[PDB]
UniProtKB/Swiss-Prot annotation, chain A:
Modifications after synthesis and translation: Monoubiquitinated by RNF181.
Subcellular compartments: Cytoplasm
Subunit structure: Component of the 19S proteasome regulatory particle complex. The 26S proteasome consists of a 20S core particle (CP) and two 19S regulatory subunits (RP). The regulatory particle is made of a lid composed of 9 subunits, a base containing 6 ATPases including PSMC2 and few additional components. Interacts with NDC80/HEC; this interaction is detected only during M phase. Interacts and SQSTM1. Interacts with PAAF1. Directly interacts with TRIM5.
Induction pattern: Expression is not cell cycle-dependent and occurs throughout the cell cycle.
Transmembrane region(s): none
Family (UniProt): Belongs to the AAA ATPase family.
Coiled coil: none
Protein name as catalogued: 26S proteasome regulatory subunit 7
Disulphide linkage map: none
Amino acids binding ATP: G42, P43, P44, G45, T46, G47, K48, T49
Stated role: Component of the 26S proteasome, a multiprotein complex involved in the ATP-dependent degradation of ubiquitinated proteins. This complex plays a key role in the maintenance of protein homeostasis by removing misfolded or damaged proteins, which could impair cellular functions, and by removing proteins whose functions are no longer required. Therefore, the proteasome participates in numerous cellular processes, including cell cycle progression, apoptosis, or DNA damage repair.
Top-level lineage group: Eukaryota
Curated annotation (Swiss-Prot), chain B:
Record's subcellular location: Cytoplasm; Nucleus
The protein's name: 26S proteasome regulatory subunit 6A
Presence of keyword ATP-binding: yes
GO process annotations (BP): blastocyst development; modulation by host of viral transcription; positive regulation of proteasomal protein catabolic process; positive regulation of transcription by RNA polymerase II; proteasome-mediated ubiquitin-dependent protein catabolic process
Function (record text): Component of the 26S proteasome, a multiprotein complex involved in the ATP-dependent degradation of ubiquitinated proteins. This complex plays a key role in the maintenance of protein homeostasis by removing misfolded or damaged proteins, which could impair cellular functions, and by removing proteins whose functions are no longer required. Therefore, the proteasome participates in numerous cellular processes, including cell cycle progression, apoptosis, or DNA damage repair.
GO cellular component: a single term: ficolin-1-rich granule lumen
Keywords: Acetylation, ATP-binding, Cataract, Cytoplasm, Deafness, Host-virus interaction, Intellectual disability, Neuropathy, Nucleotide-binding, Nucleus, Phosphoprotein, Proteasome, Ubl conjugation
Residue positions binding ATP: G80, P81, P82, G83, T84, G85, K86, T87
Protein family: Belongs to the AAA ATPase family.
Assembly and oligomerization: Component of the 19S proteasome regulatory particle complex. The 26S proteasome consists of a 20S core particle (CP) and two 19S regulatory subunits (RP). The regulatory particle is made of a lid composed of 9 subunits, a base containing 6 ATPases including PSMC3 and few additional components. Interacts with PAAF1. (Microbial infection) Interacts with HIV-1 Tat.
Length: 173, 292, 353
C-alpha cells in the first residue's frame, strides 16, 4: 500500500521474483524458464524502498539483504572469503534472496595506468561475477540488484548475459 | 616426506601414508561432467575447431606426433565479451574427452595470508600429474596477471609471482607438457607479455559479435525445448540484432515467455519475439515525439 | 620363515623412544651445558661420558633426552628443503648446443662462471677479484633460464635451484634465515651454482610504505645484502638473477658486488634466426624441397620461443592436411598467418633497460 502509483514497474518486477516462488509448478509446466534477476537504478525516488515491498510481500522464508561497502575492506583478501561464503549459505537457504545495495561502490571499472588502485576493487567485482557465472546450481537463489548510476561498463556489460529486466524510474508521472 | 603415522608419545613411525594435502587445496573442485554439449552452439564452427583441436589432438594422436615430431599445444587464450560464452563451450568439450576436469577461479589465488596462491598452484598441478591426463580451467586471468607498473607494491604481486612460477614451471621443467590447462579472459587490456609460448598461451582467437546466421540458430537451439508457433521468419530477428549478444538472445526467449503469462497463450508466437527484443534493447524510455 | 623373526626382534629395539633435537649454546662448566631446543626453551643440563667436550662446541645440533634432557647422540647438520633444490634436471649437453644466440653473451657467461673454478690462479696474479654475481634479464627476446640451466648441466659440479615462492613461508618469514642456511650448505658443498628467478617480487623497492608483507620482503633483502656485503667469502659460489625488468632491483642490487655484471637479452638477429630455425627443423619431417630464408625474411622481430611456436604451428597445421611429409609452402602459410597474429597480440612488449 506504500506504492506511489507506479504500475507497470512494480508489476514487471513482481513477476520476476514473487510469482516464480508463489506458483513454481506454473512456470515449470509452461517453461521455458524464469529469468535470473533484475537491476534497479535512476533518480533517488524511490531507491531501495521497493525492496521493502518484497520484505512485506515475502510469503514464507525470509530473505537476506546486503550492504555494498562492507565487501571492500582493508587487508586485501578478506573480500574473497566474504563473497564466497554467503553463496554456500544461500544454497543451503533453498531459494532465499540475496540483494546487494550500491553495487557502484564495488563496481569500479576498469583499469588505470598506476597504481592500483582498482586492483583490490577489480578483485571484488570480478570474483563476484565469476562466482555468479558458475554452473552449479546455479544458484536457484535468484538475484536482486540496485544502485544509483548505471556505471560502470564492466558490470553493465557482464549483466545482460547473466541478468535481465533493467528498469528505469519512473518516478512520478 | 610427511603424513607419516606416529603414535602419541611413542615417537615411532609405523607406516608412511600418502599423499600430500590439503582439503580444498588438495582438491579445488570435483567436476563430474557438464550437462551441455557442443550441439548447443552455432556459428562458431570455424573457431570451435581451433579450440577442439588443441585439446583433442594430443590425446589420441600421440602415436602420430612421435612420427612427425609434433609438439602439442598446451594453453589456449579464449577471450571476448559475453557472448561468445567461451566458458560453457570449453567445459562442454571436456565431457567428450573423458579427461579429469578441475574448476578453478582466478581470484581464488588471492588469499588473506601470503604464499597461499603459490603453494596452491604447486598443489594444483601435483594432483594434475597424479590424475594425468586431466584438464584445468581458469578465468579472469587478466585480473590476477596485472603487473601494474611502478613498485612498491602490487597487491596481486604474490599472484604475479605465482603466475610467473607457473610459467617458470613450464620453463625450467619439461613434465608440465602433460595435463593441458585452459585459460580465458574477458578482456585483453591487461595481459602479461610473458604468456607467449607453446606451453603458455599459444592458440589465440578474437571473438566478435555473432553473425546474424548464428544469432538466428543459437536462439532456435535455446527455444527448441519451448513450444513455438510454426511461423517464424528467423531472418527478421537476425537482421534486427546489432550489438546484441547470444546470451541476450536467451534473455529475449525468456522475455517472450514473460508476457505470455499475461497473454494466456500456451504456445509462443512470432510477434512475441520481436516484442521482447525491443523490450530490453535498446534501453529506455522517453517517448515518441518531435519525429512527427 | 626366520627373517620374519629378525624383523620382530627389530620391534623389540623399536620399544626405545626417540629424543628431542636441540642446539648447543655454551657450557658453563663440565657439568653444565646450555642447550636450546628448536622450540625456543633453553636448558642448562649435563652430558654423558661417551661425548667429548672438544667435539661438541657451541652451535651444534644435538639430540636431548626426553626426561633428563641431556645429550646422547649428535648430528653434524641437516636441512629439509635443500634436498629438493639439488634434484633439478636439465637436459643437454645437446640442448646447450641448440640454443644458438646470443653467441658472445654465452662467451661471457662461460667465462665468468666456469673460469674462476678451473683457473683460480690467473685471478690471483693480476689482482682481480672473481665476480661473485651476475644478472641476466629479459624478455627483450628470450632464453634466460634455458641458457643458464644448460650451464648447470654442462659444467656439472653442483647446482642449486630456488623458486621465488620459497621466501614467503606464510607467517614467520624465517625463510630469510633459511637464506643463511642456504649459504651455509653453499659454503659446505662448494662450489655450487644458485639461480634466482623472478627477483622483482622479492627484491622490490618499498617505494610506497603500505600493507604488511611489503616489509617482510625488505627483511629478506637484508639477508641477501648483508651476506653479499660480508664478512663472508662467496668467491667459490656462484649466483644468477633474472627478472622482467631491472626497475625494482634498488641501488642495492644494481650496485656491483651483489650483481657484478649485467647481460640483457636482445631480439634474435636474422642471422641467429636462421640458426635457431635450423635446430627446430631437425626433429621435424619436411619435404626434400626446403628454403629457410623465406621464413627468415618473413619473420622479423620475433622471440626465439615465438619462432619455435611458429614452427610447431606450421607442423600442427599439417595434421589437418594429414600428409606425412610436409612441404614448406604449407609451412609458410601457417608461419606467415599465425605469426602475424602473434604481432596483433604483441602489445606492450616494449620493456625498460
Ligand atoms: N555464440 C554463441 N553460440 C551459442 N550460444 C551462445 C553464444 N553466445 C552466448 N551463448 C549463450 O549465452 C549463455 C550465457 O553465456 P555467457 O556468454 O554469459 O558465458 P561466458 O561469457 O562464457 O561467461 P564468462 O564471461 O564468465 O566467460 C550461454 O548459455 C550460451 O549458450
Ligand atoms: N635459444 C633458444 N633455443 C631453443 N629454444 C628456445 C630458445 N629460446 C627460447 N626457447 C623456447 O622458449 C621456452 C622458454 O625459454 P625461456 O626461459 O627463454 O622463456 P622465458 O625466458 O620464460 O620467456 P619470458 O621471459 O618471455 O617468460 C623453451 O621451452 C624453449 O623451447
Amino acid at each position: 500500500s506504500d506504492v506511489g502509483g507506479c504500475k507497470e514497474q512494480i508489476e514487471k518486477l513482481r513477476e520476476v521474483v514473487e510469482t516464480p516462488l508463489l506458483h513454481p509448478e506454473r512456470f515449470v509446466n509452461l517453461g521455458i524458464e524464469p529469468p535470473k534477476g533484475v537491476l534497479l537504478f535512476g533518480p533517488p525516488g524511490t531507491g531501495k524502498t521497493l525492496c521493502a515491498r518484497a520484505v512485506a510481500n515475502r510469503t514464507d522464508a525470509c530473505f537476506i539483504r546486503v550492504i555494498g561497502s562492507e565487501l571492500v575492506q582493508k587487508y586485501v583478501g578478506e573480500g574473497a572469503r566474504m563473497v564466497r561464503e554467503l553463496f554456500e549459505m544461500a544454497r543451503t537457504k533453498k531459494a532465499c534472496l540475496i540483494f546487494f545495495d550500491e553495487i557502484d561502490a564495488i563496481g569500479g571499472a576498469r583499469f588505470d595506468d598506476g597504481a592500483g588502485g582498482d586492483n583490490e576493487v577489480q578483485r571484488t567485482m570480478l570474483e563476484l561475477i565469476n562466482q555468479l557465472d558458475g554452473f552449479d546450481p546455479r544458484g536457484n537463489i535468484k538475484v536482486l540488484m540496485a544502485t544509483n548510476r548505471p556505471d560502470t561498463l564492466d558490470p553493465a556489460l557482464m549483466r545482460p548475459g547473466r541478468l535481465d529486466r533493467k528498469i528505469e524510474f519512473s518516478l512520478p508521472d | 616426506g610427511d603424513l607419516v603415522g606416529v603414535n602419541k608419545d611413542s615417537y615411532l613411525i609405523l607406516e608412511t601414508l600418502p599423499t600430500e594435502y590439503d582439503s580444498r587445496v588438495k582438491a579445488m573442485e570435483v567436476d563430474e561432467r557438464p550437462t551441455e554439449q557442443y550441439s548447443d552452439i552455432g556459428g562458431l564452427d570455424k573457431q570451435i575447431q581451433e579450440l577442439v583441436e588443441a585439446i583433442v589432438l594430443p590425446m589420441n594422436h600421440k602415436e602420430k606426433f612421435e612420427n612427425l615430431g609434433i609438439q602439442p599445444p598446451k594453453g589456449v587464450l579464449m577471450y571476448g565479451p559475453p557472448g561468445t560464452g567461451k566458458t560453457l563451450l570449453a567445459r562442454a568439450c571436456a565431457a567428450q574427452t573423458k579427461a579429469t576436469f578441475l574448476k578453478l577461479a582466478g581470484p581464488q589465488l588471492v588469499q588473506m595470508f601470503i604464499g597461499d596462491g603459490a603453494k596452491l598452484v604447486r598443489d594444483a598441478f601435483a594432483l594434475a600429474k597424479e590424475k594425468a591426463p586431466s584438464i584445468i580451467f581458469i578465468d579472469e586471468l587478466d585480473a590476477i596477471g596485472t603487473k601494474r607498473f611502478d613498485s612498491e607494491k602490487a597487491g596481486d604481486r604474490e599472484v604475479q609471482r605465482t603466475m610467473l612460477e607457473l610459467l617458470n614451471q613450464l620453463d625450467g621443467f619439461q613434465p608440465n607438457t602433460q595435463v593441458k590447462v585452459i585459460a580465458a579472459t574477458n578482456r585483453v587490456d591487461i595481459l602479461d607479455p610473458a604468456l607467449l609460448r607453446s606451453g603458455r598461451l599459444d592458440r589465440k582467437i578474437e571473438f566478435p559479435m555473432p553473425n546474424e546466421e548464428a544469432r538466428a540458430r543459437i536462439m532456435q537451439i535455446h527455444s527448441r525445448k519451448m513450444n513455438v508457433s510454426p511461423d517464424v521468419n528467423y531472418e527478421e530477428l537476425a537482421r534486427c540484432t546489432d550489438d546484441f549478444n547470444g546470451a541476450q538472445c536467451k534473455a529475449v526467449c525468456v522475455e517472450a515467455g514473460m508476457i505470455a503469462l499475461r497473454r494466456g497463450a500456451t504456445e509462443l508466437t512470432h510477434e512475441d519475439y520481436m516484442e521482447g527484443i525491443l523490450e530490453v534493447q535498446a534501453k529506455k524510455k522517453a517517448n515518441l515525439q518531435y519525429y512527427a | 620363515t626366520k627373517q620374519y623373526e629378525k624383523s620382530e626382534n627389530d620391534l623389540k629395539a623399536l620399544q626405545s623412544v626417540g629424543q628431542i633435537v636441540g642446539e648447543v649454546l655454551k657450557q658453563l662448566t663440565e657439568e653444565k651445558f646450555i642447550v636450546k631446543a628448536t622450540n625456543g626453551p633453553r636448558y642448562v643440563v649435563g652430558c654423558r661420558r661417551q661425548l667429548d667436550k672438544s667435539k661438541l662446541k657451541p652451535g651444534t645440533r644435538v639430540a636431548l633426552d626426553m626426561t633428563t634432557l641431556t645429550i646422547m647422540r649428535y648430528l653434524p647438520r641437516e636441512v629439509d628443503p635443500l634436498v629438493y633444490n639439488m634434484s633439478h634436471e636439465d637436459p643437454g649437453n645437446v640442448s646447450y648446443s641448440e640454443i644458438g644466440g646470443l653467441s658472445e653473451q654465452i662467451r661471457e657467461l662461460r667465462e665468468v662462471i666456469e673460469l674462476p673454478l678451473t683457473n683460480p690462479e690467473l685471478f690471483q696474479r693480476v689482482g682481480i677479484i672473481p665476480p661473485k654475481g651476475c644478472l641476466l634479464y629479459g624478455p627483450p627476446g628470450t632464453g634466460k633460464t634455458l641458457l643458464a640451466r644448460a650451464v648447470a648441466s654442462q659444467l656439472d659440479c653442483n647446482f642449486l635451484k630456488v623458486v621465488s615462492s620459497s621466501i614467503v613461508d606464510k607467517y614467520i618469514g624465517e625463510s630469510a634465515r633459511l637464506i643463511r642456511e642456504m649459504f651455509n650448505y653453499a659454503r659446505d658443498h662448494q662450489p655450487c651454482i644458485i639461480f634466482m628467478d623472478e627477483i622483482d617480487a622479492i627484491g622490490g623497492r618499498r617505494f610506497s610504505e603500505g600493507t604488511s608483507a611489503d616489509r617482510e620482503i625488505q627483511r629478506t633483502l637484508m639477508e641477501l645484502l648483508n651476506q653479499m656485503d660480508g664478512f663472508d667469502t662467496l668467491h667459490r659460489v656462484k649466483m644468477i638473477m633474472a627478472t622482467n625488468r631491472p626497475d625494482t632491483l634498488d641501488p642495492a642490487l644494481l650496485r656491483p658486488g651483489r650483481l657484478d655484471r649485467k647481460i640483457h637479452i636482445d631480439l634474435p638477429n636474422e642471422q641467429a634466426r636462421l640458426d635457431i630455425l635450423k635446430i627446430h627443423a631437425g626433429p621435424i619431417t619436411k619435404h626434400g624441397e626446403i628454403d629457410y630464408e623465406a621464413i627468415v625474411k618473413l619473420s622479423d622481430g620475433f622471440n626465439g620461443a615465438d619462432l619455435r611456436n611458429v614452427c610447431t604451428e606450421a607442423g600442427m597445421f599439417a595434421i589437418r592436411a594429414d600428409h606425412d611429409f610436409v612441404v614448406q609452402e604449407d609451412f609458410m602459410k601457417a608461419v606467415r598467418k599465425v605469426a602475424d597474429s602473434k604481432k596483433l597480440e604483441s602489445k606492450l612488449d616494449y620493456k625498460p633497460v
